[PDB]
Amino acid sequence: AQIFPRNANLLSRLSIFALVLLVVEGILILGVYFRSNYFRQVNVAIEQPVAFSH
Amino acid sequence: MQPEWSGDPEVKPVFLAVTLTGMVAFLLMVWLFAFYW
């Protein structure tokens, strides 16, 4: 209470928890983007110069 | 010696929240890294 306010305990516990969760979320971001259908161009009908129809 | 949070009412739902964190985050890495391709 000399330096910090009353909810410093609240903010510090939430900050350590949030740091763990953003590490987990950044790993989830990297994994999702490297497996994404945008990255590997999966289920994307890539346009050909004639538009052949199979 | 016991911890200073041993006789606190927060010790039940916070330590339930650590395992509910574990079974959400770790199972999310399980879903992404094994069942998502």
Partner: peptide, 25 residues
């Protein structure tokens, strides 16, 4: 707090599940 743990993890769950859906967008 513990209800803050639940709320933060539910926000992380919703945002992460939206991200997982966006990887199959």
């Amino acid at each position: 707090l513990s209800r803050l743990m639940i709320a933060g993890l539910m926000v992380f769950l919703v945002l992460s599940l939206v991200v997982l859906l966006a990887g199959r967008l």
